[PDB]
Design a protein around this ligand. Structure first.
Ligand SMILES: O=c1ccn([C@@H]2O[C@H](COP(=O)(O)OP(=O)(O)O)[C@@H](O)[C@H]2O)c(=O)[nH]1
Ligand SMILES: O=c1ccn([C@@H]2O[C@H](COP(=O)(O)OP(=O)(O)O)[C@@H](O)[C@H]2O)c(=O)[nH]1
Ligand SMILES: Nc1ncnc2c1ncn2[C@H]1C[C@H](O)[C@@H](CO)O1
Ligand SMILES: Nc1ncnc2c1ncn2[C@H]1C[C@H](O)[C@@H](CO)O1
Lengths: 225, 217
């Protein structure tokens, strides 16, 4: 019986670092990266995904729908094989969810006009459908940082394509993160999700070698599920 | 147990007509129309407006809309389910062509073929065919039946597009040259009927043949 936690948050808040911290604290703990993050920097999968990322960055109003499609189906399959292959008290740690795909990223491209009524309408259906047709999660852990901490972090990361991402986007993605995971205001069609329990974690301070409290906070919340 | 038979055919080759014609003949005989037929209506219209913009998006909605429709009907004594085209049609006819005519790029094309390879590796689950019936018509023929059908946005279909498509049908369903990542398919028997002659009020010969074919599977 595998528990299922999603680790969520804005660009450069510290998810993969956190995910690769818990990684070696237990062998009942496994981690599934987010596919997009491997296409992000530096095989047929990587080829395509990196092709798709650059195009979405260069002309989002043309490539948002295809990007969202490939990136969600990639997380989906990446997530399926981690039931297969590995894991007494097993937890799987997901690096973002198919819900972030949709209520954070996909949603923001509609409202910014990068996907049109048809595009976004056809995405909501596929999504609803592809997901109803094993990965529903036991909990969500929210690593909350500011747009500014987020903005500084991507600069410390130094990714080519990401240096141009401006504070105003991050500022939109923070708001949706907030409405979903803290005031629990955002409303959806995965109903269980309205009451999956969530833990919010302040990672504005650097925790790269001072993380015991955050982890005790994780261990405690696992205990409550 | 429900036998699954796809009616393949170029545009307006007779497909919708023969399949309904069939629909009345037997208790044991039902049909799943092509969802693009009823069209989807914007995505199809955007498809005719600017195909190098919408080809990828349509193909995905088109094909998944057919998988849903077919599954739905996947739930008589000697059951036979007839489909109107199929997910091989969607990939080796249409997406293939559309990649071939640069309305999709390699990324697009690779990303489609992977998603089709996967959307249907969980879903051969009675969408896998028992036979194919190829309504072979000449392109010339199909071009008149499009004026026959007298359909708005379908009026300007060239002469040459319809050519592209039949050469692809014939390589797939008559010469059997064409190769795919469903090894089963190359097994599967095909039946090949000529439909240039009208048949609305003269189909017994046709249906007789259908009947021999089903009888041997
Ligand atoms: O406590 C931390 C967490 C991370 N980072 C740095 O911020 C950048 C982005 O973090 P990460 O890739 O883990 O963020 P994610 O997008 O996965 O949330 C990397 O250079 C990290 O080393 C940091 O300076 N202090
Ligand atoms: O023997 C026939 C077969 C078809 N049609 C007509 O050809 C047009 C297109 O037929 P259908 O929708 O069956 O073509 P499909 O696209 O479904 O192959 C319609 O007006 C049919 O009435 C016809 O006149 N004689
Ligand atoms: N669904 C998605 N998942 C992950 N990233 C997304 C997604 N949509 C857009 N992006 C943008 C954020 C970064 O610029 C870049 C790398 O994450 O892609
Ligand atoms: N998968 C598909 N199924 C049926 N039609 C397709 C498909 N892809 C493109 N087309 C084009 C042909 C017609 O002009 C128009 C209506 O059939 O759509």
């Amino acid at each position: 019986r595998i528990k299922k936690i999603s680790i969520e948050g804005n660009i450069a808040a510290g998810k993969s670092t956190f995910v690769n911290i818990l990684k070696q604290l237990s062998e009942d703990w496994e981690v599934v990266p987010e596919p997009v993050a491997r296409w992000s920097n530096v095989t047929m999968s990587q080829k395509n995904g990196g092709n798709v990322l650059q195009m979405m960055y260069e002309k989002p109003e043309r490539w948002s729908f295809t990007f969202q499609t490939y990136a969600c189906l990639s997380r989906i399959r990446a997530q399926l094989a981690s039931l297969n292959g590995k894991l007494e008290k097993p937890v799987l740690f997901f690096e973002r969810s198919v819900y972030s795909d949709r209520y954070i990223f996909a949603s923001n491209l509609y409202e910014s006009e990068s996907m049109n009524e048809t595009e976004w309408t056809i995405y909501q259906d596929w999504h609803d459908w592809m997901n109803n047709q094993s990965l529903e999660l036991d909990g969500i852990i929210y690593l909350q940082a500011t747009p500014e901490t987020c903005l500084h972090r991507i600069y410390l990361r130094g990714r080519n394509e990401e240096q141009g991402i401006p504070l105003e986007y991050l500022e939109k993605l923070h708001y949706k993160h907030e409405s979903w995971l803290l005031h629990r205001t955002l409303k959806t069609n995965f109903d269980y999700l309205q009451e999956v329990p969530i833990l919010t974690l302040d990672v504005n301070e650097d925790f790269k070698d001072k993380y015991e409290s955050l982890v005790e906070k994780v261990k405690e919340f696992l205990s409550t599920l």
